[PDB]
Amino acid sequence: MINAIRTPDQRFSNLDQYPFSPNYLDDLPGYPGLRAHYLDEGNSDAEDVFLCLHGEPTWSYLYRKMIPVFAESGARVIAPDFFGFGKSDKPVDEEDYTFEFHRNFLLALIERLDLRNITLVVQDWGGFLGLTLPMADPSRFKRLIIMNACLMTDPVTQPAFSAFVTQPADGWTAWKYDLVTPSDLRLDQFMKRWAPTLTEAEASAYAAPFPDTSYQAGVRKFPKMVAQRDQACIDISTEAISFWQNDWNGQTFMAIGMKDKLLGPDVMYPMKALINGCPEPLEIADAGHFVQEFGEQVAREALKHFAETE
């Protein structure tokens, strides 16, 4: 079994702009005893479902500006927290966290809730994982909103998606050094550095899930998994490419956080070329890596784009 700890609800008591009522699932196939938290907003009987996937080191809090917009259009919004993150249970051992550990959780959740007509909404690890889900059951997915993300494939198949692991020094090397080498990891202080428009209250909401380092085994493992891609990760990621090029016939919307040192234009303009029918990217000039902090514009533009297409 997997040994996990749970964050005290008290830590989430007064989160700025997070009025969303909690939903949980403690009975997922392959994840016994592990309770997963997810948001389930908007009309539950909606034709469209926006599945919003977060990355590192965030949780569904990152979608708080986008969720109202999507919901007001008549849609259902599902925003799950990865194990190790947010209000989900947190495995204490880093080795329990793998690519398939998170990917199979997502497949398990989509089946349990039986989600169809999915507009996939992705960024960072939500992208790395999320972009390999449509091929597993393509009839469930109808659209994609891709923000600063790509696939964890091998450096030969796609050099773009590995070159940042090399450089620049103030880029990935800094991002990884800040997350895996501090024994005193203050996620609010980290997020104030990498998302410099965050208010003090917003930033502390990113530290809320982690009372102390014993809750951060999953926050440490994600950077390590980018650097050291395992065979299952490469095979699934490289097979996902062929899906996006050849099989994908759904509506796509892309938005780039232009100030992002790691997963900005040089990762995203390759990513565009691989997604069949991907239009011109909305380039948000003032946005860094966490484009969802400029998410009200992205959400509105995506709905406008999708509506003026079909």
Side-chain angles (χ1 to χ4, degrees), residues 256-295:
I256 311 170
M258 294 310 276
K259 283 177 162 186
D260 188 11
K261 295 180 188 171
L262 63 108
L263 297 176
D266 36 71
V267 174
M268 289 307 273
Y269 277 122
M271 207 47 235
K272 180 189 178 300
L274 304 177
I275 303 170
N276 195 18
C278 189
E280 283 240 323
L282 170 60
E283 303 181 296
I284 300 95
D286 285 335
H289 185 49
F290 305 103
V291 193
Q292 302 99 321
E293 286 299 326
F294 293 65

mmCIF file of all heavy atoms in Angstrom, residues 256-295:
data_model
loop_
_atom_site.group_PDB
_atom_site.id
_atom_site.type_symbol
_atom_site.label_atom_id
_atom_site.label_comp_id
_atom_site.label_asym_id
_atom_site.label_seq_id
_atom_site.Cartn_x
_atom_site.Cartn_y
_atom_site.Cartn_z
ATOM 1 N N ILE A 256 0.416 31.502 -24.897
ATOM 2 C CA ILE A 256 1.792 31.508 -24.402
ATOM 3 C C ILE A 256 2.056 32.638 -23.396
ATOM 4 O O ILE A 256 1.777 33.818 -23.646
ATOM 5 C CB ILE A 256 2.853 31.680 -25.560
ATOM 6 C CG1 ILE A 256 2.583 30.702 -26.720
ATOM 7 C CG2 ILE A 256 4.255 31.421 -25.001
ATOM 8 C CD1 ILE A 256 3.405 30.946 -27.980
ATOM 9 N N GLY A 257 2.568 32.240 -22.252
ATOM 10 C CA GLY A 257 3.139 33.190 -21.303
ATOM 11 C C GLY A 257 4.542 33.592 -21.774
ATOM 12 O O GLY A 257 5.528 32.887 -21.494
ATOM 13 N N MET A 258 4.609 34.717 -22.496
ATOM 14 C CA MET A 258 5.838 35.139 -23.191
ATOM 15 C C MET A 258 7.086 35.390 -22.337
ATOM 16 O O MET A 258 8.219 35.203 -22.802
ATOM 17 C CB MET A 258 5.542 36.388 -24.022
ATOM 18 C CG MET A 258 4.576 36.136 -25.169
ATOM 19 S SD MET A 258 4.999 34.725 -26.220
ATOM 20 C CE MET A 258 6.174 35.515 -27.317
ATOM 21 N N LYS A 259 6.870 35.729 -21.068
ATOM 22 C CA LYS A 259 7.960 35.925 -20.114
ATOM 23 C C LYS A 259 8.531 34.640 -19.513
ATOM 24 O O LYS A 259 9.439 34.707 -18.681
ATOM 25 C CB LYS A 259 7.489 36.833 -18.984
ATOM 26 C CG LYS A 259 7.453 38.299 -19.394
ATOM 27 C CD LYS A 259 6.918 39.149 -18.269
ATOM 28 C CE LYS A 259 7.273 40.604 -18.491
ATOM 29 N NZ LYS A 259 6.892 41.449 -17.318
ATOM 30 N N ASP A 260 8.001 33.464 -19.872
ATOM 31 C CA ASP A 260 8.475 32.193 -19.346
ATOM 32 C C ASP A 260 9.808 31.726 -19.929
ATOM 33 O O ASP A 260 9.910 31.321 -21.077
ATOM 34 C CB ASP A 260 7.433 31.091 -19.575
ATOM 35 C CG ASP A 260 7.740 29.753 -18.886
ATOM 36 O OD1 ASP A 260 8.653 29.655 -18.031
ATOM 37 O OD2 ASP A 260 7.055 28.754 -19.184
ATOM 38 N N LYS A 261 10.774 31.624 -19.034
ATOM 39 C CA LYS A 261 12.123 31.158 -19.359
ATOM 40 C C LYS A 261 12.227 29.679 -19.769
ATOM 41 O O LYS A 261 12.984 29.325 -20.669
ATOM 42 C CB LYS A 261 13.027 31.407 -18.160
ATOM 43 C CG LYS A 261 13.238 32.867 -17.797
ATOM 44 C CD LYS A 261 14.151 32.979 -16.584
ATOM 45 C CE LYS A 261 14.256 34.398 -16.037
ATOM 46 N NZ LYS A 261 14.976 34.430 -14.735
ATOM 47 N N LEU A 262 11.466 28.802 -19.127
ATOM 48 C CA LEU A 262 11.504 27.373 -19.452
ATOM 49 C C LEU A 262 10.586 26.903 -20.568
ATOM 50 O O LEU A 262 11.044 26.490 -21.625
ATOM 51 C CB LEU A 262 11.224 26.519 -18.196
ATOM 52 C CG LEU A 262 9.896 26.562 -17.431
ATOM 53 C CD1 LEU A 262 9.070 25.282 -17.659
ATOM 54 C CD2 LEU A 262 10.228 26.698 -15.920
ATOM 55 N N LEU A 263 9.283 27.098 -20.423
ATOM 56 C CA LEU A 263 8.293 26.523 -21.348
ATOM 57 C C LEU A 263 7.553 27.602 -22.144
ATOM 58 O O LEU A 263 6.330 27.598 -22.307
ATOM 59 C CB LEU A 263 7.267 25.623 -20.595
ATOM 60 C CG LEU A 263 7.834 24.377 -19.898
ATOM 61 C CD1 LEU A 263 6.729 23.705 -19.156
ATOM 62 C CD2 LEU A 263 8.436 23.404 -20.885
ATOM 63 N N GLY A 264 8.347 28.579 -22.554
ATOM 64 C CA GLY A 264 7.811 29.655 -23.375
ATOM 65 C C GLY A 264 7.895 29.387 -24.878
ATOM 66 O O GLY A 264 7.870 28.249 -25.334
ATOM 67 N N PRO A 265 8.078 30.414 -25.709
ATOM 68 C CA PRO A 265 7.972 30.331 -27.183
ATOM 69 C C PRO A 265 8.758 29.209 -27.854
ATOM 70 O O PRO A 265 8.210 28.486 -28.679
ATOM 71 C CB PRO A 265 8.409 31.711 -27.657
ATOM 72 C CG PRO A 265 7.966 32.566 -26.514
ATOM 73 C CD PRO A 265 8.400 31.798 -25.299
ATOM 74 N N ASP A 266 9.995 28.994 -27.425
ATOM 75 C CA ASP A 266 10.837 27.942 -28.002
ATOM 76 C C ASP A 266 10.425 26.493 -27.741
ATOM 77 O O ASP A 266 10.892 25.568 -28.399
ATOM 78 C CB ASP A 266 12.291 28.141 -27.545
ATOM 79 C CG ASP A 266 12.432 28.643 -26.133
ATOM 80 O OD1 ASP A 266 12.165 27.869 -25.188
ATOM 81 O OD2 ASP A 266 12.775 29.832 -25.991
ATOM 82 N N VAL A 267 9.516 26.325 -26.787
ATOM 83 C CA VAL A 267 8.872 25.044 -26.479
ATOM 84 C C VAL A 267 7.492 25.052 -27.143
ATOM 85 O O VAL A 267 7.104 24.091 -27.808
ATOM 86 C CB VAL A 267 8.719 24.861 -24.934
ATOM 87 C CG1 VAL A 267 7.911 23.610 -24.656
ATOM 88 C CG2 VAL A 267 10.078 24.746 -24.256
ATOM 89 N N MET A 268 6.760 26.160 -27.061
ATOM 90 C CA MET A 268 5.379 26.239 -27.555
ATOM 91 C C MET A 268 5.199 26.295 -29.080
ATOM 92 O O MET A 268 4.255 25.723 -29.630
ATOM 93 C CB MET A 268 4.674 27.450 -26.904
ATOM 94 C CG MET A 268 4.363 27.301 -25.427
ATOM 95 S SD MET A 268 3.450 25.785 -25.105
ATOM 96 C CE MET A 268 1.756 26.319 -25.350
ATOM 97 N N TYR A 269 6.097 26.954 -29.809
ATOM 98 C CA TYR A 269 6.038 26.986 -31.281
ATOM 99 C C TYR A 269 6.400 25.667 -31.975
ATOM 100 O O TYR A 269 5.757 25.352 -32.972
ATOM 101 C CB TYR A 269 6.944 28.102 -31.837
ATOM 102 C CG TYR A 269 6.274 29.450 -31.827
ATOM 103 C CD1 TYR A 269 6.825 30.537 -31.143
ATOM 104 C CD2 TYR A 269 5.056 29.618 -32.487
ATOM 105 C CE1 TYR A 269 6.165 31.762 -31.119
ATOM 106 C CE2 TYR A 269 4.396 30.833 -32.470
ATOM 107 C CZ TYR A 269 4.952 31.903 -31.777
ATOM 108 O OH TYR A 269 4.286 33.107 -31.735
ATOM 109 N N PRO A 270 7.345 24.842 -31.483
ATOM 110 C CA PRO A 270 7.338 23.383 -31.688
ATOM 111 C C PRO A 270 6.033 22.646 -31.333
ATOM 112 O O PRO A 270 5.480 21.901 -32.133
ATOM 113 C CB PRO A 270 8.520 22.893 -30.859
ATOM 114 C CG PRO A 270 9.442 24.038 -30.979
ATOM 115 C CD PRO A 270 8.566 25.222 -30.763
ATOM 116 N N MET A 271 5.489 22.860 -30.142
ATOM 117 C CA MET A 271 4.229 22.244 -29.680
ATOM 118 C C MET A 271 3.054 22.539 -30.620
ATOM 119 O O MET A 271 2.355 21.630 -31.047
ATOM 120 C CB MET A 271 3.958 22.761 -28.263
ATOM 121 C CG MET A 271 3.154 21.835 -27.398
ATOM 122 S SD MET A 271 3.693 20.105 -27.427
ATOM 123 C CE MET A 271 2.103 19.398 -27.891
ATOM 124 N N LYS A 272 2.910 23.782 -31.062
ATOM 125 C CA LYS A 272 1.932 24.190 -32.088
ATOM 126 C C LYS A 272 2.029 23.355 -33.390
ATOM 127 O O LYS A 272 1.043 22.775 -33.831
ATOM 128 C CB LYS A 272 2.144 25.673 -32.429
ATOM 129 C CG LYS A 272 1.191 26.200 -33.478
ATOM 130 C CD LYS A 272 1.596 27.584 -33.910
ATOM 131 C CE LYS A 272 0.673 28.098 -34.993
ATOM 132 N NZ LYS A 272 0.700 27.231 -36.198
ATOM 133 N N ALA A 273 3.239 23.227 -33.938
ATOM 134 C CA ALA A 273 3.541 22.470 -35.153
ATOM 135 C C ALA A 273 3.125 20.994 -35.118
ATOM 136 O O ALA A 273 2.876 20.398 -36.173
ATOM 137 C CB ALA A 273 5.027 22.553 -35.421
ATOM 138 N N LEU A 274 3.064 20.429 -33.903
ATOM 139 C CA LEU A 274 2.671 19.028 -33.680
ATOM 140 C C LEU A 274 1.171 18.843 -33.462
ATOM 141 O O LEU A 274 0.644 17.735 -33.579
ATOM 142 C CB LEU A 274 3.390 18.443 -32.459
ATOM 143 C CG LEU A 274 4.920 18.487 -32.438
ATOM 144 C CD1 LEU A 274 5.434 17.916 -31.110
ATOM 145 C CD2 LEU A 274 5.475 17.666 -33.583
ATOM 146 N N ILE A 275 0.447 19.885 -33.089
ATOM 147 C CA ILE A 275 -0.991 19.747 -32.870
ATOM 148 C C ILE A 275 -1.754 20.091 -34.143
ATOM 149 O O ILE A 275 -1.808 21.226 -34.612
ATOM 150 C CB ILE A 275 -1.470 20.661 -31.697
ATOM 151 C CG1 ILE A 275 -0.688 20.346 -30.410
ATOM 152 C CG2 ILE A 275 -2.949 20.393 -31.423
ATOM 153 C CD1 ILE A 275 -0.882 21.323 -29.263
ATOM 154 N N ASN A 276 -2.343 19.072 -34.718
ATOM 155 C CA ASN A 276 -3.168 19.200 -35.921
ATOM 156 C C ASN A 276 -4.202 20.339 -35.808
ATOM 157 O O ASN A 276 -4.942 20.453 -34.827
ATOM 158 C CB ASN A 276 -3.874 17.866 -36.149
ATOM 159 C CG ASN A 276 -4.458 17.734 -37.525
ATOM 160 O OD1 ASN A 276 -4.102 18.450 -38.451
ATOM 161 N ND2 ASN A 276 -5.395 16.859 -37.719
ATOM 162 N N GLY A 277 -4.167 21.259 -36.755
ATOM 163 C CA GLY A 277 -5.102 22.384 -36.790
ATOM 164 C C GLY A 277 -4.955 23.439 -35.685
ATOM 165 O O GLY A 277 -5.865 24.251 -35.463
ATOM 166 N N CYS A 278 -3.832 23.430 -34.959
ATOM 167 C CA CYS A 278 -3.534 24.441 -33.934
ATOM 168 C C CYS A 278 -3.424 25.822 -34.576
ATOM 169 O O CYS A 278 -2.560 26.029 -35.432
ATOM 170 C CB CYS A 278 -2.205 24.182 -33.226
ATOM 171 S SG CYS A 278 -1.938 25.253 -31.789
ATOM 172 N N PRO A 279 -4.291 26.787 -34.222
ATOM 173 C CA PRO A 279 -4.238 28.145 -34.774
ATOM 174 C C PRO A 279 -3.078 28.999 -34.277
ATOM 175 O O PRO A 279 -2.168 28.530 -33.594
ATOM 176 C CB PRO A 279 -5.620 28.727 -34.432
ATOM 177 C CG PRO A 279 -5.877 28.097 -33.121
ATOM 178 C CD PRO A 279 -5.445 26.665 -33.317
ATOM 179 N N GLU A 280 -3.096 30.270 -34.656
ATOM 180 C CA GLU A 280 -2.134 31.241 -34.144
ATOM 181 C C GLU A 280 -2.260 31.374 -32.624
ATOM 182 O O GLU A 280 -3.363 31.618 -32.116
ATOM 183 C CB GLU A 280 -2.400 32.572 -34.766
ATOM 184 C CG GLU A 280 -1.889 32.663 -36.184
ATOM 185 C CD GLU A 280 -0.848 33.805 -36.330
ATOM 186 O OE1 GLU A 280 -0.996 34.903 -35.683
ATOM 187 O OE2 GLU A 280 0.119 33.577 -37.131
ATOM 188 N N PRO A 281 -1.177 31.184 -31.865
ATOM 189 C CA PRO A 281 -1.166 31.355 -30.400
ATOM 190 C C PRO A 281 -1.504 32.742 -29.840
ATOM 191 O O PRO A 281 -1.074 33.760 -30.382
ATOM 192 C CB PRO A 281 0.232 30.908 -29.973
ATOM 193 C CG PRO A 281 1.031 31.302 -31.175
ATOM 194 C CD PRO A 281 0.166 30.795 -32.309
ATOM 195 N N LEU A 282 -2.302 32.806 -28.791
ATOM 196 C CA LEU A 282 -2.521 34.070 -28.107
ATOM 197 C C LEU A 282 -1.271 34.297 -27.248
ATOM 198 O O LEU A 282 -0.972 33.553 -26.308
ATOM 199 C CB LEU A 282 -3.760 34.000 -27.230
ATOM 200 C CG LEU A 282 -3.997 35.180 -26.260
ATOM 201 C CD1 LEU A 282 -4.138 36.475 -27.040
ATOM 202 C CD2 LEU A 282 -5.257 34.934 -25.452
ATOM 203 N N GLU A 283 -0.455 35.265 -27.602
ATOM 204 C CA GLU A 283 0.769 35.543 -26.852
ATOM 205 C C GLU A 283 0.529 36.558 -25.750
ATOM 206 O O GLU A 283 0.394 37.743 -26.022
ATOM 207 C CB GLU A 283 1.832 36.061 -27.808
ATOM 208 C CG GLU A 283 2.182 35.141 -28.980
ATOM 209 C CD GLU A 283 3.259 35.735 -29.867
ATOM 210 O OE1 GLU A 283 3.022 36.795 -30.493
ATOM 211 O OE2 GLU A 283 4.360 35.150 -29.930
ATOM 212 N N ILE A 284 0.408 36.143 -24.503
ATOM 213 C CA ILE A 284 0.245 37.098 -23.407
ATOM 214 C C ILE A 284 1.624 37.603 -22.973
ATOM 215 O O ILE A 284 2.377 36.952 -22.239
ATOM 216 C CB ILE A 284 -0.499 36.448 -22.196
ATOM 217 C CG1 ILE A 284 -1.894 35.978 -22.626
ATOM 218 C CG2 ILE A 284 -0.685 37.465 -21.071
ATOM 219 C CD1 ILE A 284 -1.941 34.526 -23.013
ATOM 220 N N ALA A 285 1.929 38.807 -23.435
ATOM 221 C CA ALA A 285 3.223 39.474 -23.206
ATOM 222 C C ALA A 285 3.686 39.671 -21.761
ATOM 223 O O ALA A 285 4.877 39.652 -21.480
ATOM 224 C CB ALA A 285 3.224 40.846 -23.873
ATOM 225 N N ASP A 286 2.731 39.859 -20.860
ATOM 226 C CA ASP A 286 3.018 40.091 -19.448
ATOM 227 C C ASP A 286 3.036 38.865 -18.552
ATOM 228 O O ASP A 286 3.358 38.933 -17.366
ATOM 229 C CB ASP A 286 2.011 41.085 -18.897
ATOM 230 C CG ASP A 286 2.274 42.513 -19.341
ATOM 231 O OD1 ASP A 286 3.447 42.851 -19.666
ATOM 232 O OD2 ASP A 286 1.290 43.298 -19.350
ATOM 233 N N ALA A 287 2.650 37.743 -19.139
ATOM 234 C CA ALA A 287 2.583 36.494 -18.408
ATOM 235 C C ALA A 287 3.887 35.686 -18.441
ATOM 236 O O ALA A 287 4.591 35.599 -19.453
ATOM 237 C CB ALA A 287 1.419 35.683 -18.965
ATOM 238 N N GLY A 288 4.255 35.167 -17.282
ATOM 239 C CA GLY A 288 5.357 34.232 -17.202
ATOM 240 C C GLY A 288 4.872 32.788 -17.347
ATOM 241 O O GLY A 288 3.973 32.454 -18.121
ATOM 242 N N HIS A 289 5.426 31.894 -16.541
ATOM 243 C CA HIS A 289 5.098 30.462 -16.571
ATOM 244 C C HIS A 289 3.660 30.097 -16.139
ATOM 245 O O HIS A 289 3.060 29.166 -16.702
ATOM 246 C CB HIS A 289 6.104 29.701 -15.682
ATOM 247 C CG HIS A 289 5.968 28.209 -15.718
ATOM 248 N ND1 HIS A 289 5.889 27.455 -16.873
ATOM 249 C CD2 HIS A 289 5.884 27.321 -14.712
ATOM 250 C CE1 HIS A 289 5.768 26.177 -16.599
ATOM 251 N NE2 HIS A 289 5.762 26.094 -15.296
ATOM 252 N N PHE A 290 3.176 30.787 -15.102
ATOM 253 C CA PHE A 290 1.828 30.546 -14.580
ATOM 254 C C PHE A 290 0.808 31.449 -15.293
ATOM 255 O O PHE A 290 0.312 32.459 -14.784
ATOM 256 C CB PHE A 290 1.835 30.795 -13.056
ATOM 257 C CG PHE A 290 2.880 29.961 -12.373
ATOM 258 C CD1 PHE A 290 4.085 30.548 -11.962
ATOM 259 C CD2 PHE A 290 2.688 28.595 -12.159
ATOM 260 C CE1 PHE A 290 5.093 29.790 -11.357
ATOM 261 C CE2 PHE A 290 3.685 27.832 -11.557
ATOM 262 C CZ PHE A 290 4.883 28.431 -11.154
ATOM 263 N N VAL A 291 0.483 31.056 -16.519
ATOM 264 C CA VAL A 291 -0.383 31.873 -17.379
ATOM 265 C C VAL A 291 -1.795 32.016 -16.795
ATOM 266 O O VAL A 291 -2.457 33.035 -16.990
ATOM 267 C CB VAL A 291 -0.460 31.256 -18.816
ATOM 268 C CG1 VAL A 291 -1.088 32.263 -19.764
ATOM 269 C CG2 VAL A 291 0.936 30.899 -19.321
ATOM 270 N N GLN A 292 -2.214 31.044 -15.981
ATOM 271 C CA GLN A 292 -3.530 31.081 -15.344
ATOM 272 C C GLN A 292 -3.660 32.245 -14.365
ATOM 273 O O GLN A 292 -4.783 32.650 -14.076
ATOM 274 C CB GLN A 292 -3.808 29.784 -14.624
ATOM 275 C CG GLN A 292 -3.759 28.574 -15.526
ATOM 276 C CD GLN A 292 -2.431 27.862 -15.432
ATOM 277 O OE1 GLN A 292 -1.367 28.485 -15.327
ATOM 278 N NE2 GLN A 292 -2.436 26.546 -15.464
ATOM 279 N N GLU A 293 -2.564 32.854 -13.905
ATOM 280 C CA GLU A 293 -2.659 34.080 -13.107
ATOM 281 C C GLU A 293 -3.102 35.292 -13.944
ATOM 282 O O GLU A 293 -3.549 36.310 -13.433
ATOM 283 C CB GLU A 293 -1.324 34.348 -12.451
ATOM 284 C CG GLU A 293 -1.074 33.381 -11.300
ATOM 285 C CD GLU A 293 -2.080 33.449 -10.165
ATOM 286 O OE1 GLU A 293 -2.605 34.540 -9.848
ATOM 287 O OE2 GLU A 293 -2.331 32.408 -9.542
ATOM 288 N N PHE A 294 -2.974 35.159 -15.272
ATOM 289 C CA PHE A 294 -3.580 36.039 -16.292
ATOM 290 C C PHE A 294 -4.692 35.201 -16.961
ATOM 291 O O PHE A 294 -4.985 35.312 -18.151
ATOM 292 C CB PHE A 294 -2.546 36.451 -17.350
ATOM 293 C CG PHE A 294 -1.453 37.328 -16.835
ATOM 294 C CD1 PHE A 294 -0.536 36.858 -15.888
ATOM 295 C CD2 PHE A 294 -1.392 38.665 -17.232
ATOM 296 C CE1 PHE A 294 0.432 37.697 -15.335
ATOM 297 C CE2 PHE A 294 -0.431 39.518 -16.688
ATOM 298 C CZ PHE A 294 0.479 39.033 -15.731
ATOM 299 N N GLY A 295 -5.400 34.383 -16.178
ATOM 300 C CA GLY A 295 -6.365 33.421 -16.703
ATOM 301 C C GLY A 295 -7.724 33.939 -17.138
ATOM 302 O O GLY A 295 -8.371 33.301 -17.967
#
